[PDB]
Amino acid sequence: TGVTLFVALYDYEAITEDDLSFHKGEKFQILNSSEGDWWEARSLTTGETGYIPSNYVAPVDSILEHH
């Protein structure tokens, strides 16, 4: 479960240093998902770490499997 990579479905502009800003289509490694609707993630584009809203991302593999 930990090695599952995720992809942003929507753009997001963070308003605090602790959160990541990202574009739709950018991919993430999830560092911690045990504190609620906000996951600690690493951006696979910049390498920055921060919290992301989990409802903005989906498993990368689920894109090709979309109906």
UniProtKB/Swiss-Prot annotation:
Phosphorylated at tyrosine residues, which can be enhanced by NTN1. Residues 1-62 form the SH3 domain. It is found in: Cytoplasm; Nucleus; Cell membrane; Perikaryon. Isoform 1 is highly expressed in the brain. Isoform 2 is expressed in cells of hemopoietic lineages, especially T-lymphocytes. It comes from the Eukaryota. Belongs to the protein kinase superfamily. Tyr protein kinase family. SRC subfamily. Interacts (via its SH3 domain) with PIK3R1 and PRMT8. Interacts with FYB1, PAG1, and SH2D1A. Interacts with CD79A (tyrosine-phosphorylated form); the interaction increases FYN activity. Interacts (via SH2 domain) with CSF1R (tyrosine phosphorylated). Interacts with TOM1L1 (phosphorylated form). Interacts with KDR (tyrosine phosphorylated). Interacts (via SH3 domain) with KLHL2 (via N-terminus). Interacts with SH2D1A and SLAMF1. Interacts with ITCH; the interaction phosphorylates ITCH and negatively regulates its activity. Interacts with FASLG. Interacts with RUNX3. Interacts with KIT. Non-receptor tyrosine-protein kinase that plays a role in many biological processes including regulation of cell growth and survival, cell adhesion, integrin-mediated signaling, cytoskeletal remodeling, cell motility, immune response and axon guidance. Inactive FYN is phosphorylated on its C-terminal tail within the catalytic domain. Following activation by PKA, the protein subsequently associates with PTK2/FAK1, allowing PTK2/FAK1 phosphorylation, activation and targeting to focal adhesions. This is Tyrosine-protein kinase Fyn. It comes from Homo sapiens. The lineage of its organism: Eukaryota, Metazoa, Chordata, Craniata, Vertebrata. The gene is FYN.
